[PDB]
Amino acid sequence: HTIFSSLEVNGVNQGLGEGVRVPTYNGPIEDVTSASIACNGSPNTVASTSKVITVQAGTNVTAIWRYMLSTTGDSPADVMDSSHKGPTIAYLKKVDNAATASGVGNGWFKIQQDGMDSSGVWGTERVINGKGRHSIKIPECIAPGQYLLRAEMIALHAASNYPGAQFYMECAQLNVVGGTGAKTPSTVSFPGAYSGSDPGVKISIYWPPVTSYTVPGPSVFTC
Template identity: 25%
Template sequence: MSWKLTIVLAGAFATRATLAHGILGGFITDGVSNPSFETEYIYRIQNGNPVPDLAAWSTESLDRGYIEPNSFGTLDMICHKNAVPGVLTAKVASGGTVDFFWPKWPHNVGPVLTYIAPCGGDCASVDKSTLRFTKIDEAGYDNGWAGQKLMDNNFTWTTTVPSTIAPGNYVFRHEIINLHSGAEANGAQNYPQCVNIEITGSGTDSPAGVLGVDLYKADDAGILFDPYADTIDYPLPGPALYVPGSGSDSTDMASTAAASTAAASASATALSQAVPGTPTALSTTVTPVVPTSTENEASNSSVVPTVIPTTLLTRTSNAPVATTAPGTDSGTVRLYGQCGGKGYTGPTKCKSGTKCEKSPKNPLYYSKCVPA
């Protein structure tokens, strides 16, 4: 990624005083910036207030938390907690790039992965349970963790779209897996984020893909993994990486499209769309909102005001949103759970009988609850 694009990323996306490490701050498709779904929009939806039309999917993750391995078989694993499709669709040419921006991401130990799934129509009405994902990008440990490389690259990860992929509307599922506690059962932390993107071009491949609930198992070698071993030989989790020109399965794609169309009208979601919306050009007029300065933000001088499109959507929600951080009990951290470290914003009080202690192998970034 060029230095010019790095400047664009720094200047195009939102950060507010509450911004933490669990969600996208925005994404760029072939040089066009696209805003993300912000945590504050959850409150707007709950109060019946309008939120911007976005290509990014909405979630109900108020704590910007993760999906734990024990939840891998649930719908939350697909695009995060109670995720709902965005109403817009961004656009990228086959062979082009998508840059995913994770402002202030603090976890340097773990892989970065990107998947795509064909919608078979408008992604705004797709049933996420029918989406079949193909992995088009992956990075684990190669002279350093992919998570650290993302942080070093202005908190940005660039994925190149294979030129052989057939044109159409796709859900891009971008994910970081934090492995600080990966050596413990249910210790990995998955942060999936989804956006709607149309791929243009002349490719012909339509891989069959894998259902989102089947991407990983809790005991997969790349999920239950000790990142602090003397020798790191990390096996990337999930299905095999797509090989350009590996063919297609038109039957699976047609089935996905039919199932998506049939199920969309009956799909019950915690966030119901009051206004359906239609895809529009992404050169929408935007209004900057100046963030409130905090001690945490002072460490990152590249953070600038939010870009929010003026096109609005009203949504309503009847489902309560849990505010307790995953892996905790009433704000306390479980045994071997993370309780501190540089950039960590979660709970710090260990449950009874345990204490918070710095990791001897990564004391700056990671502390965990150990037996007292």
Template identity: 30%
Template sequence: MPVVDVQSTDLICRTHDMTYKAEPFAIEAGQDIRITWSKEKMTSPYTGIDPVGPCVFWLSPLEKKGVGKVWSKIHEYTNDGGEDAANWCSAKIVNSKNYYDFTIPGEIIPGKYLLRTEIIDIISAGKTNYDDFTMGPHFYSNCLVLDITGNGTAPLKNPVSIIDVYKPYYKKPFYVEGTKNNLFKLPGPAPYTTGKP
């Protein structure tokens, strides 16, 4: 199920039972990581179809438990400049058999981190009907624990609060249909890297 209330703390990792005590996945800084989504979990319970929209990936030091200004955006992909569903990151994921690859920044300090992965369904994101939470953007976010190794010395860049940077979309459209997609901006600061068409 997606999160539809940007004021809910579920927006951080989506499920109440996602804990920071999960078994860590070991990876070296600078390596590619492959994230795979379950087909069943991607399909919207409201529309019965796959989400259409951008994806974004965040890191936070594990000991912070995802609370407060601790999240750094490390990668995002909106679309390749087109105006239809086939151009968004979500289509890239579906066409790749539900996986997406990106690189863990090579310069970050080794340690345990929470990785937040997210697909944002914008099918109804031009509206802000939060009376029954069927309208507005639908956030498919999940977290996993990474044990990042390497020789990096840099702290995470531009840490923010997930709740704070998404909160403005409680009362305004997340995406205005018909606008130029190269003007589309995801919440939060610029990432370490962006997706390439």
């Protein structure tokens, strides 16, 4: 249970819910086929925002994850429970209007992923125990204009069977400036990318203990 409530650019945070469609409840979407898998949604309620953050291509943004919108601290308990072990992912979608685009369907291409490392530490354990910071790279070769950043952190403490995995995600509104458009990513669709039978969704992380993890979705897009 957590929420990506605020995003940081030029080293400064843009504010709670400013440029980020946030849910009022920190509940996960468990039906990968449901339209809410893209940018959250029913049975949760997501608020709208009319702020499009101006980011210059090539630079990092950092998604701040928080146990609740009213959360004020940054301790491991203020981000998410320690049991919520799993990967952390980020996508981008080219839209005409980041302030109103739904974000459901084709157009998503992966840009960051942090699953299990050689030591066996999950990406969530670093966001939780790293003050909720989820650093993400904005490529330089994509085209400039409006975009939708979909940060995500999945928990697998009960994904032994499907339904079981817990998908937490919130989408941010961006305006990429300076992109050289020197490459066109091969995009996927949300819903459609994840499947209940994928090795990353359906998985028993304790019986037996896992050592290699397969982050769902496509490969990372690199210029």
